[PDB]
């Protein structure tokens, strides 16, 4: 007993190679993006728009404190830089 | 060095002490007055792609 395809699946198959290779690339792509986010955040960061106010504020509430805060606390005037390469403002005006 | 009186008028903003009106060069305005990238311009540069930069929040 003949158990082939049917004929339009047959004639749709015959593109599933492309779609097979398609979906590798694309899953590929894909997931070094995922990796490449992942990667320095040992997670997926939510975007910092996607926040609350709050929320904006207690996430960068610790990178204030450890980069503009204790410079500014331990501060004396010969930790300056002579020349112009200092820290930049955290606004800039 | 100018004076105790030099000192205390140099230092004096506002008649009116009630109000606070803290010194700002510029004020915030993207993300609601916040600011999204508190590094330097290499550091979210390289955050954005090395690790060891996040020291998270936990
Ligand atoms: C690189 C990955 C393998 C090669 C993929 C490219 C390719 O040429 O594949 C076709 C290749 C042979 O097909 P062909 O001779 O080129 O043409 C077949 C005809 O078109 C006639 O088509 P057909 O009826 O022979 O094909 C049926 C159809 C059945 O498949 C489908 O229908 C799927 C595609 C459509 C999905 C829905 C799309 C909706 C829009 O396609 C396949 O069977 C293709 C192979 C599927 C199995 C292998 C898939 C591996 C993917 C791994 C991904 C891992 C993550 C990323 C890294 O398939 C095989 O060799 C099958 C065995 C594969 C074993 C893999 C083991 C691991
Ligand atoms: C070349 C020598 C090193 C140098 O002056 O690098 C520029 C610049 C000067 O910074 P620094 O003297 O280390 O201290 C400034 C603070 O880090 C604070 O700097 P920052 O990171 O806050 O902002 C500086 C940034 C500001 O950039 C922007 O505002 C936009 C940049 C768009 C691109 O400028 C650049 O990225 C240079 C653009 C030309 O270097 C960096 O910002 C770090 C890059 C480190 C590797 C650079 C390649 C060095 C190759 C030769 C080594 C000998
Ligand atoms: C040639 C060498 C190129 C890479 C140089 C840096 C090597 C390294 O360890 O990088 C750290 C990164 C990953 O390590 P990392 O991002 O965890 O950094 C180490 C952690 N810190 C910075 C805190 C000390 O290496 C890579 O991502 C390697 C990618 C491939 C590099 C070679 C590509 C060759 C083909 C083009």
């Known amino acids: 007993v003949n158990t082939a395809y049917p004929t339009p699946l047959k004639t749709i198959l015959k593109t599933t190679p492309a779609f097979v290779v398609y979906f590798v690339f694309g899953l590929g792509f894909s997931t070094v993006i995922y990796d490449v986010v992942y990667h320095p955040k040992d997670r997926i960061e939510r975007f910092y728009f996607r926040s609350s106010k709050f929320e904006r504020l207690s996430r960068k509430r610790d990178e204030k404190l450890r980069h503009y805060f204790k410079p500014a606390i331990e501060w004396q005037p010969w ?7 200092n820290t930049r403002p955290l606004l800039r005006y | 060095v100018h004076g105790e009186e030099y000192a205390q008028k140099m230092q004096k903003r506002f008649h009116q002490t009630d109000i606070w009106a803290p010194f700002r060069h510029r004020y915030a305005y993207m993300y609601n007055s916040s600011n999204k990238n508190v590094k330097d311009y290499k550091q979210v540069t390289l955050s954005r792609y090395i690790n060891g930069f996040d020291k998270f929040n936990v």
């Open chain 1, 79 to 85: 930790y300056n830089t002579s020349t112009n390469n």
